[PDB]
Design a protein around this ligand. Structure first.
Ligand code: HEA
Ligand code: HEA
Ligand code: CU
Lengths: 102, 534, 121, 113, 59, 47, 269
């Protein structure tokens, strides 16, 4: 019924205010990526900081490779490339130089 | 210690016992159908010295045994008494005495039908018992009376079970559960039970009338004496077609439950198709007479019947597309339930295609009683019942036992039954277009190669049944090994690329009921507290 | 072996101890002592409201988060409950498993539920 | 004095649902009593006289018009109904019993020897 | 009455199967419903014992 | 009547037994799987 | 242990069961009936009393089991609203099934209204055959049953309201009327109309009456077993099972019997 989508976003931030472990990060990431909506860099950075609140680099790998392979969206690459480049340069998580040469 | 297996007040023991009885009847029917197909493998008398009387005796035994003792008892009783009062939060189901009485009147039916099949005269009129085809002059002895008694007691058992299910649904509902948003399984069982309650009594009355005709030698449906057997023919149609719905709709609910608990996404148009299934249950009393197009009804009556029979056919395609959307956009796993449901849906699409081909009345004149009609209902009944039961077993065995079942054995089993069914059922199109004449112990040898491939497929099915029993032995002997190693599937659904290993370990199943994470069936006192839901 | 007044809602224990004296002549007595078994306690409870095996709804409307998790009044070790949102319905029901050995999570509310004993000596 | 430690979970506080159920049960009982009274009154007023009149006239007509079959055993073959293949046809041979080889000793069904 | 209480006390002080209720009826029924049941069941399927041995052989 | 954990006792058969370690009863099940059609044929015809 | 006590005496209505072979001996008696019927179909001995004795002992066994089970129901106690409501609902379902059987049997001979047959009849009545008319034989029985139903339409409710000497008088008159009914049914037992062997034209009404008399037979049997249960001092004004059914028995019986009496006696003659 093309319901509102920002309500679930606000639910994500209010659970972030109530976040108590990496479990909530997993739940909110699954809920957000399940939706058809493409996450803006703001909510992507919010999810990244939620995952880093426990400082788990594997969760950073998860979220980055999920952004790289979230939705086909008629095969959107260049936007994905620039977005991953900036969300990498903000903190620095070099991992594509290891799994790709396999 | 024997009261558990003779006076089971709990539903689970009765469920597994009905399952054992149904599987025994099914394996016996499969073996004797293999024997029949071997008789029909080549024209003549190679293993049985003709005996068309005996031929039709085993033919009717085939039909009656699989219809009345394989599809019916387990497929409804086990799933109903194991889920319908358990998921709703009820502590224990009522009427244990009724279920025990039904069980203990069943062996009357088994023994009487065995005696009826094992007399010199015997009843061999097939699934149709319309007089004077079912007259005592040809099929003498006590076979007809024993068959009638078995019919009566089986109808009583099924009707009482449906009554128990209905009263459990109507009264034992938990406080925190709306009626409009019930699961598809609950509504499926509801519609099936109500259709059974409105269909079985009519057939029971007709069967009682035939019993009175055979005993008191009166004149109701005999041609001599101004009788009208077409009344009982219409009664049998208004039983069978709603009985076909009774056999199929719980399979639809089971497939819906499997896809909902596996695909991890909601079923498209869930409430809309709950309403559609309610409409099907309400309107099933109007499309029961699309088989009698040649009896001599009026042209306007033919038009009404055909209009109804293709105006109530849309929800089949609606369900097909709804389940297609349910598996669309989600994650599908290379598991046996997925492939079982896919094969069942595909072969059901072909079966419904053949039925729609049969929906026309003008084509029926040259198509009725040809090979096409029997091929069509063999398609729909065979795939529906057999694959629904197989999917239910392979989807519910760890739910009721907790001992894992081998993935490799299940996959090879599926491949065997699937290839057997395809090789048997593909040539039926050519067989129908040529006009193979049905129910002939010595058919013309033109169809020799097709009979050979049908026999090969039947023998493949029988060795598949041997694989079934060997798989049961393997599970019983190595469930501990299956739990220890990875030779068997451990979890129903694979994780997505969002879940950490620990999180998925502590969130193994997120379904609509606690049954999956309910421990292996507890003692007779389970669900001591009501189920709360919001 | 003495007669029991049975005037208290909690002092009666054991349907065997209750028999119920008969009457010689008169009218049918009220539904206080003529009933046999323990059905009289149950019918009195439904007459007044104080009931065992109560079907009254729990705090389903309450979110039941870590600030104030929902309560369950039962001494049984296992738990068969569910909670998928404060309103009447917003998502498919998922069962909750309160326990003392470990913690529980809701996957939509993220609530840690604590099973609630009854006071014992 | 039964041993009770704290309380046997008396339950949630009461509400008006119990009294509503009480009112419904009392209304059902009162409806049953009222329909009993009214139906008994109307029955004894009208039905019993009408039922008695129907019974007596039916008994009279049965005593009058249903007593001519006593002499059917002995009758000349002059007013016999026009029969056909409906009667006088072969049936299953019967071997049980001794008397006339018949299921019941009613030698009146067939008047032809 | 004067016997219901005594019977209840006996049952409470002695829990045994068969309900200790119909001993004479049990002795009249169960041994009879065994011996007479055998005597009425066995001959029906023992009459064809002489005919038993059919090999479906003809000349 | 309430002493069934429900792990291996749900089956209406006894796993224990040296004479029948699920070997004699299940061989009887094997026999009765094809027994009824064979005897039905044997009553009137030959197999 | 108060919570344990409430969860064990209120949420656990389970009754202990010892390995009693009653169900298997009941099934054995049923198999005995089946083999007796098979022997009637084909047998080498011409005796008739053996099958009658087998049927009689089976009926006595069933009646004994029913009176026994109601005896343990009234005797073990442990009765709540759950057991009473469940047994009442089950008995209502059973009487509804009996009503549906009555309706089916009525429609079995009711369906000849438009006369859709083809030959040898096809216009009721099929004039041309002068057989024995079934009409006017059981009208005395149906009218006296109508009188009994009229007088007991609310006599059961009067009994449940009073439970006094008037209840005893009602039970006595019920016994007398059912005895009169069974005697007037027994008077025409063998030589009622003729032997049912050949030439059927109007035996359908007689067959219907004969099959309908059976339910009245077990009605009398259940009334007698209820009276004997009161003679055993088991069915008091507690978890009543006889009363809870006999209150609605007349209301569910009179409707269907009036349906079967307005037609099938005033029609088809
Ligand atoms: C219930 C529907 C149904 C099903 C499933 C089948 C299944 C089959 N039928 Fe039959 N058939 C009928 C309904 C059905 N049939 C009817 C109504 C007739 C007409 C009756 C007549 O007029 O008398 C008929 C007639 C009929 C004939 C005509 C008889 C003739 O005159 O010679 C033939 C011919 O060979 C035949 C063959 C088959 C075959 C090969 C299968 C194969 O599909 C069999 C494969 C089945 C199995 C796979 C069973 C597996 C067994 C198990 C152990 C189950 C395990 C499950 C669990 C409990 C977990 N059928
Ligand atoms: C599983 C049960 C089942 C199902 C689903 C069907 C489905 C259908 N059946 Fe069939 N049928 C039987 C069970 C079943 N049947 C049995 C046992 C018999 C034998 C009885 C007797 O005759 O002896 C029988 C026989 C039978 C006959 C007897 C032929 C003759 O008179 O002798 C006819 C005739 O019209 C018929 C019609 C149909 C139709 C129109 C459908 C349709 O409902 C099919 C629905 C599916 C489709 C709709 C196709 C897929 C979806 C789409 C492509 C959507 C778009 C298409 C359209 C809406 C046009 N069936
Ligand atoms: Cu149809």
């Amino acid at each position: 019924d093309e319901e509102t989508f920002e309500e679930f976003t606000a639910r994500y931030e209010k659970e972030f205010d109530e976040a108590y472990d990496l479990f909530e990060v997993q739940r909110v990431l699954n809920n957000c990526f399940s939706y058809d909506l493409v996450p803006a860099p703001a909510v992507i950075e919010k999810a990244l900081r939620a995952a880093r609140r426990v400082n788990d680099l594997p969760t950073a790998i998860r979220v980055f490779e999920a952004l790289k392979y979230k939705v086909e969206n008629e095969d959107q690459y260049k936007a994905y490339l620039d977005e991953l480049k900036d969300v990498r340069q903000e903190l620095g998580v070099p991992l594509k130089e290891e799994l790709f040469p396999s | 210690m024997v009261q558990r297996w003779l006076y089971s007040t709990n539903a689970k023991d009765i469920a597994v016992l009905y399952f054992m009885l149904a599987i025994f009847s099914g394996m016996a029917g499969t073996a004797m159908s293999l024997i029949i197909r071997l008789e029909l493998a080549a024209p003549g008398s190679q293993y049985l010295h003709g005996n068309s009387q005996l031929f039709n005796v085993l033919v009717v035994g085939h039909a009656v045994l699989m219809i009345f003792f394989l599809v019916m008892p387990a497929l409804i009783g086990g799933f109903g008494n194991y889920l319908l009062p358990l998921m709703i939060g009820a502590t224990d189901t009522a009427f244990p005495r009724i279920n025990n009485i039904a069980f203990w009147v069943l062996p009357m039916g088994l023994v009487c039908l065995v005696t009826s099949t094992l007399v010199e005269s015997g009843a061999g009129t097939g699934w149709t018992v319309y007089p004077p085809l079912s007259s005592i002059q040809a099929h003498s002895g006590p076979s007809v009376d024993l068959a009638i008694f078995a019919l009566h007691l089986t109808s009583i058992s099924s009707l009482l079970g449906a009554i128990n299910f209905i009263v459990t649904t109507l009264n034992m509902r938990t406080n925190g559960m709306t009626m409009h948003k019930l699961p598809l399984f609950v509504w499926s069982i509801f519609i099936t039970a109500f259709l059974l309650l409105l269909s079985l009594p009519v057939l029971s009355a007709g069967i009682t009338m035939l019993l009175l005709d055979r005993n008191f030698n009166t004149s109701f449906f005999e041609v001599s004496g101004g009788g009208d057997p077409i009344l009982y023919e219409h009664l049998f149609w208004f039983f069978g077609h709603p009985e076909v719905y009774i056999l199929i709709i719980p399979g639809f609910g089971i497939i819906s439950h499997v896809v909902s608990t596996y695909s991890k996404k909601p079923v498209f148009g869930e409430i809309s198709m709950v309403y559609a299934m309610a409409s099907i249950g309400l309107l099933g009393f109007l499309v029961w007479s699309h088989h009698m197009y040649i009896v001599g009804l009026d042209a306007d009556t033919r038009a009404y019947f055909t209009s109804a029979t293709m105006i109530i056919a849309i929800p089949t395609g609606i369900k097909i597309f709804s389940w297609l959307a349910t598996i669309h956009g989600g994650s599908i796993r290379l598991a046996t339930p997925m492939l079982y449901a896919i094969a069942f849906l595909f072969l059901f699409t072909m079966g419904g295609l053949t039925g729609v081909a049969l929906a026309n009345a003008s084509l029926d004149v040259a198509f009725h009683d040809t090979y096409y009609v029997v091929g069509h209902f063999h398609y729909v009944l065979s795939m529906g019942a057999i694959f629904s039961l197989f999917a239910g077993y392979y989807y519910w065995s760890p739910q009721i036992l907790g001992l894992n079942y081998n993935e490799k054995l299940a996959q090879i089993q599926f491949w065997l039954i699937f290839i057997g069914a395809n090789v048997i059922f593909f040539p039926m199109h050519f067989l129908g277009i040529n006009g193979m004449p049905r129910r002939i112990p010595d058919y013309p040898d033109a169809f020799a190669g097709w009979n050979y491939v049908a026999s090969i497929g039947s023998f493949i099915a029988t060795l598949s049944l041997f694989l079934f029993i060997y798989i049961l032995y393997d599970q019983l002997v190595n469930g501990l090994n299956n739990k220890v190693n990875n030779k068997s599937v451990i979890y129903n659904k694979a994780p997505d690329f969002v879940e950490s290993n620990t999180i998925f370990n502590l969130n193994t199943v997120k379904s609509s009921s606690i049954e999956f994470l309910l421990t292996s069936p507890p003692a007779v006192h389970s669900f001591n507290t009501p189920a709360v839901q919001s | 072996p003495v007669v029991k007044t049975a005037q208290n809602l909690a002092e009666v224990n054991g349907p065997e101890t209750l028999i119920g004296p008969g009457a010689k002549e008169g009218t049918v007595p009220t539904d206080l002592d003529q009933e046999t078994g323990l059905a009289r306690l149950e019918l009195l409870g439904k007459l007044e409201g104080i009931d065992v095996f109560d079907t009254k709804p729990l705090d389903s409307s309450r979110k039941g988060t870590m600030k104030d998790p929902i309560i369950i009044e039962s001494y049984d070790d296992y738990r068969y409950v569910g909670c998928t949102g404060s309103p009447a319905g917003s998502h498919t029901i998922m069962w909750l498993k309160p326990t003392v050995n470990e913690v529980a999570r809701c996957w939509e509310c993220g609530s840690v539920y604590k099973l609630n004993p009854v006071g014992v000596p | 004095l039964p041993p009770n430690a704290l309380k046997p979970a008396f339950g949630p506080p009461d509400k008006v649902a119990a009294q509503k159920f009480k009112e419904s049960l009392m209304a059902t009982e009162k409806h049953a009593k009222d329909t009993s009274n009214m139906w008994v009154k109307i029955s004894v007023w009208v039905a019993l006289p009408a039922i008695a009149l129907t019974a007596v006239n039916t008994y009279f007509v049965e005593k009058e018009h249903a007593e001519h079959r006593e002499h059917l055993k002995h009758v000349p073959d002059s007013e016999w109904p026009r029969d056909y293949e409906f009667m006088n046809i072969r049936s299953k041979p019967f071997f049980w019993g001794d008397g006339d080889k018949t299921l019941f000793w009613n030698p009146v069904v067939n008047r032809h020897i | 009455a004067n016997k219901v209480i005594q019977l209840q006390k006996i049952f409470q002080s002695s829990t045994k199967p068969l309900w200790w209720r119909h001993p004479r009826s049990a002795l009249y029924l169960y041994p009879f419903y065994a011996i007479f049941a055998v005597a009425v069941v066995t001959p029906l399927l023992y009459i064809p014992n002489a005919i038993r041995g059919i090999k479906a052989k003809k000349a | 009547v309430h002493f069934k954990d429900g792990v291996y006792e749900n089956i209406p058969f006894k796993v224990k037994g040296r004479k029948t370690p699920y070997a004699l009863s299940h061989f009887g099940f094997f026999a009765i799987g094809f027994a009824v059609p064979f005897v039905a044929c044997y009553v009137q015809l030959k197999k | 242990m108060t919570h344990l006590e409430r969860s064990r005496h209120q949420q656990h209505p389970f009754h202990m069961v010892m390995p009693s072979p009653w169900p298997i001996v009941v099934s054995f008696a049923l198999l005995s009936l089946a083999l007796s019927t098979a022997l009637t179909m084909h047998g080498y001995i011409g005796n008739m009393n053996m099958v009658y004795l087998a049927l009689f002992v089976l009926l006595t066994s069933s009646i004994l089991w029913f009176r026994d089970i109601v005896a343990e129901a009234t005797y073990l106690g442990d009765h709540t609203m759950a057991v009473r409501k469940g047994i009442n609902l089950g008995f209502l379902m059973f009487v509804l099934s009996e009503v549906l059987i009555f309706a089916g049997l009525f429609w079995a001979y009711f369906h000849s209204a438009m006369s859709p047959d083809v030959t040898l009849g096809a216009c009721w009545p099929p004039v041309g055959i002068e057989a024995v008319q079934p009409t006017e034989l059981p009208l005395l029985n149906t009218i006296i049953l109508l009188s009994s139903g009229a007088t007991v339409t609310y006599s059961h409710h009067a009994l449940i309201a009073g439970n006094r000497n008037k209840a005893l008088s009602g039970l006595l008159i019920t016994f007398w009327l059912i005895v009169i009914f069974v005697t007037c049914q027994y008077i025409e037992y063998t030589n009622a109309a003729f032997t049912i062997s050949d030439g059927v034209y109007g035996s359908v009404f007689y067959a219907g009456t004969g099959l309908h008399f059976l339910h009245m037979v077990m009605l009398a049997a259940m009334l007698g077993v209820n009276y004997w249960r009161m003679r055993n001092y088991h069915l008091t004004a507690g978890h009543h099972v006889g009363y809870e059914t006999t209150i609605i028995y007349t209301h569910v019986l009179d409707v269907i019997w009036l349906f079967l009496y307005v037609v099938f006696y005033w029609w088809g003659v």
